[PDB]
Amino acid sequence: FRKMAFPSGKVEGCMVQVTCGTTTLNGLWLDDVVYCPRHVICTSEDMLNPNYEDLLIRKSNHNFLVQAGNVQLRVIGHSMQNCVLKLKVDTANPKTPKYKFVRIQPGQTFSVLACYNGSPSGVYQCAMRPNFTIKGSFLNGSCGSVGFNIDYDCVSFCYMHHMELPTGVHAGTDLEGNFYGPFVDRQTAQAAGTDTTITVNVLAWLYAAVINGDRWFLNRFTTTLNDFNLVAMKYNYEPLTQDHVDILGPLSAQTGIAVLDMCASLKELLQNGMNGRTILGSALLEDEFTPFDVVRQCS
Amino acid sequence: FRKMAFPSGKVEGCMVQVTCGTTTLNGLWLDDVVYCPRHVICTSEDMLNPNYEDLLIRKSNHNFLVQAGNVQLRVIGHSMQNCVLKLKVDTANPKTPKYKFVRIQPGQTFSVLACYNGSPSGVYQCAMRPNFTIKGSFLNGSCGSVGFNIDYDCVSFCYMHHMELPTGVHAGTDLEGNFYGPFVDRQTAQAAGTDTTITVNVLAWLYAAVINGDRWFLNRFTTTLNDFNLVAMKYNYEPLTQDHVDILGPLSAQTGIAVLDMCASLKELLQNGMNGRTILGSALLEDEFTPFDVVRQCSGV
Ligand SMILES: *[C@H](O)[C@H](C[C@@H]1CCNC1=O)NC(=O)[C@H](CC(C)C)NC(=O)OCc1ccccc1
Ligand SMILES: *[C@H](O)[C@H](C[C@@H]1CCNC1=O)NC(=O)[C@H](CC(C)C)NC(=O)OCc1ccccc1
């Protein structure tokens, strides 16, 4: 049982490099449009406090240098949608997959294809934290890298990278240009809300540990849904809903452990700690596997 | 600090399915050759105790179904090389990347593209353990999935998947069909040797901590390589090779911390524990990041 990302080939064929003056970042080329973060139009001084509409009206098509590998693509239009710039190009990307733009909810997961200068560097799995940050691995020049899920050949784009907070976590937008969370695309120190742990994910991962022959944390105690949620909230865990309990149904049926029995197990785990033991090789309770992630990997 | 796979697109374009009778696994299509585990030619019952030379005698080119998606590739020749089958097909794969076949050492990492029915399913980072197993995530029908590194557009294939051991770890071959470790492709009870911690990777991880400012564990001592190796073995840590000292060179230069000084720091951690302190926010010493993985992630490679 490992943190597993989607194969990135369908997205790799869409990455390009976008340059305006001195600033370089990545763009997503679908059909005849290139999507990228709007702060590519900023100089260093601009970034500190930009007025984007005012900055954008002063740009021409030829201020945008888009490169797909060695080939320049000619920009023939441009518009702005929220924090995302849409560059109309004179060539259609032949490698455009079947795709959709989706806005994901907190606790959901996706794969990130980290890119620099329009070239893919690495792929890894992330979750949208409840405070709408993501614990990523991004360096300078990674903006415009996207997050995605893949279902039967259709790529669901859910994230585009824009920045790193002073705490080292990351913030971005959906493909419509709207930030996840209370962040803005300005070069200013920004704090996130207090993060919480994704409870339904922790339970899914505890079920993964059982499917893989680890049971040390189980007990014979029981709990009601409301009594578990009281303890969970006390420990900065998100509430468990009945929808979550249902979503865990297959994992419960597979292992024969009722959801509320696994809740009792996690409650003890939260109140006693792990006593220096590990679960699936982890000294901490892991919350970036969804129930579907566990099912996909285990079955 | 997270495990990051290589982008998998160059390998995805090479995955096909190979069927004999009812047995289907994955194959690797490079130029006009398809590489796959030789037990594709086994029936359910023949896997218990297979005679591969005799099983292959009864096979002809026309007994092999090679498909890229639903499109059949005609097999025009077959041979066995160690535990892999090489199927000559009549079409050169137009998506063949620049590539090499390499045999990796214990402790080296690679990305695995897990495939089923020749269809890629996920990608994750693995390390070759010192007992020559990998802690993989594989299901029925994953055999023939490959593990690989990429350097400057050249894909180095290092692993092809063949089996699961009773402890739940996995075993396989290089792309010349030579098993890593002392395993055989027979459905027999086999057991991985006792595992050990990958010292060179723990050291890499200590350097990564130092690069990020977490350096409380740096002590005022040093040690010789031989003295360190003798103590490390007492803690179930691998001995260091001369090549291990050399691949730590770049991190040693970047931090100004001598490799043998860092060794003496790790020794103190082994003899006294961490005293309830963390390193990169972990209470456990991590051993599946190589020196290259640390560099690759701190740079924009
Ligand atoms: C895009 O390549 C870049 C990604 C950052 C670079 C460092 N790690 C990343 O993920 N984005 C920015 O540099 C971004 C641009 C703004 C105009 C949105 N700025 C940023 O991330 O700095 C945030 C920050 C500002 C001031 C203090 C502390 C952090
Ligand atoms: C090839 O797809 C398969 C991979 C196994 C399937 C379960 N998880 C895996 O990694 N390899 C075999 O089935 C292999 C074939 C022999 C000729 C080497 N046998 C094997 O792995 O035996 C152990 C085992 C078999 C079936 C389920 C679980 C373990």
Last residue of a domain, one of A155, A173, A191: A173
Rg (CA), chain B: 21
A227 and A283 housed in the same domain: yes
Distance CA B218, CA A266 (A): 37
Distances, alpha carbon A196 to alpha carbons A168, A233, A262, B299, in Å: 17, 9, 19, 31
Q: From the CB of B49, is ligand 2 less than 6 Å away? A: no
Catalytic residue flag (residue A39): yes
Catalytic residue flag (residue B170): no
How many C-alpha atoms does A253 have within 13 Å on its Cβ side?
7
How many C-alpha atoms does A257 have within 13 Å on its Cβ side?
25
Query: Would A241 be classed as within a structural domain?
Result: yes
Query: Would A99 be classed as within a structural domain?
Result: yes
B112 and B14 housed in the same domain: yes
Distance CA B29, CA B17 (A): 10
Chain length of chain A? 299
B103 and B48 housed in the same domain: yes
Burial of A9 (0-12, 13-18, 19+ CB in 10 A): buried
Question: The domain spanning residue A63 has which CATH number?
Answer: 2.40.10.10
Mutation for A interface: B297, B298, B299, most A CBs within 10 A: B297
Q: Identify which of B113, B124, B283 has the shortest CB distance to residue A3.
A: B124
B163 and B228 housed in the same domain: no
Non-local (6+) Cβ contacts of B247 within 8 A are B200, B290, B291, B292
How many domains in chain B? 2
Query: Would B149 be classed as within a structural domain?
Result: yes
Query: Would B28 be classed as within a structural domain?
Result: yes
A8 touches B: beta carbon within 8 Å: yes
Last residue of a domain, one of B156, B173, B190: B173
Find the A171 Cα to ligand 1 centroid distance in Å: 9
Strand order in the sheet with B15-20: B71-73, B65-68, B15-20, B23-30, B33-37, B84-89, B75-81
B163 and B70 housed in the same domain: yes
Question: The domain spanning residue B225 has which CATH number?
Answer: 1.10.1840.10
Residue B228 near residue B240, CB atoms below 8 Å: yes
B235 and B272 housed in the same domain: yes
Non-local (6+) Cβ contacts of B49 within 8 A are B186, B188
Burial B160-172 (b: 16+ CB within 10 A, else e): bbbbbbeeebbbb
Phi first, then psi: what are they for B95, rounded to 5°?
A: -95, 10
Distance CA B222, CA B252 (A): 14
Take atom 22 of ligand 2 and give the residue whose Cα is closest: B187
Secondary structure of residue A111 in the 3-state scheme: strand
Domain that holds residue B127: 9-173
B85 and B158 housed in the same domain: yes
Distance CA A126, CA A5 (A): 9
Burial B14-33 (b: 16+ CB within 10 A, else e): bbbbbbbeebbbbbbbbebb
Ligand that comes closest to the CA of residue A25: 1
Name the catalytic one among B143, B158, B170, B244.
B143
In one-letter notation, the amino acid at residue B241 is T
Query: Would A189 be classed as within a structural domain?
Result: no
Mutation for B interface: A6, A25, A111, A123, most B CBs within 10 A: A123
Name the catalytic one among A20, A42, A143, A158.
A143
- Given in angstroms, what resolution was this structure solved at? 1.8
A69 and A113 housed in the same domain: yes
Q: How far is CA A77 from the centre of its chain?
A: 29
Ligand that comes closest to the CA of residue B55: 2
CB atoms within 10 A of CB A253: 10
Query: Would A194 be classed as within a structural domain?
Result: no
A152 and A111 housed in the same domain: yes
B21 and B157 housed in the same domain: yes
Taking CB atoms and an 8 Å cutoff, what residues of chain B touch A296?
122
- Torsion angle, alpha carbons of B13, B183, B199, B250, to 10: -40
B163 and B218 housed in the same domain: no
Maximum C-alpha span of chain A: 69
Query: Would A2 be classed as within a structural domain?
Result: no
Q: From the CB of B47, is ligand 2 less than 6 Å away? A: yes
Q: Does the distance separating the beta carbons of A4 and B7 come in below 8 Å?
A: no
Residue B18 near residue B34, CB atoms below 8 Å: yes
